[PDB]
Ligand binder design. Sequence first.
Ligand SMILES: N=C(N)NCCC[C@H](NP(=O)(O)OC[C@H]1O[C@@H](n2cnc3c(N)ncnc32)[C@H](O)[C@@H]1O)C(=O)O
Length: 124
Amino acid sequence: KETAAAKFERQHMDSSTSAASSSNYCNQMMKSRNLTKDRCKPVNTFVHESLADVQAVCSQKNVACKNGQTNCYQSYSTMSITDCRETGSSKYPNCAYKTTQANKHIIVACEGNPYVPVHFDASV
Ligand SMILES: N=C(N)NCCC[C@H](NP(=O)(O)OC[C@H]1O[C@@H](n2cnc3c(N)ncnc32)[C@H](O)[C@@H]1O)C(=O)O
């Protein structure tokens, strides 16, 4: 059964420098990562850094999470990311996305032993 850490990897990790894809990065990735299965996940961030650099964020800048938890962490360096956000005409199961590429500081929530990212909180 998928661990919280595994799920963050499937949902958010795409280690590859930058978005690369055949047609439309978000439409393809949101499908392939199973984020269109039971509905159109409305917004999803992919991170294009190594797993090691992302995991490292759990010991970087401690910040409050959007939901009021205190177990979130902001990266010290900007990171390559892509934002996927569902278009207005998107309707499950015909999920369609707008692709926005960015280099920003990521904020992840981290949990467990070992203490690793389980949730993608914000980009700053
Ligand atoms: N709710 C926040 N802060 N973010 C949700 C949208 C951002 C989206 N992050 P995500 O898919 O990794 O996580 C969203 C889910 O995470 C739950 N969630 C919100 N705060 C959380 C937290 N502090 N820790 C674990 N899960 C949290 C939300 O209810 C959503 O179900 C992204 O990819 O950009």
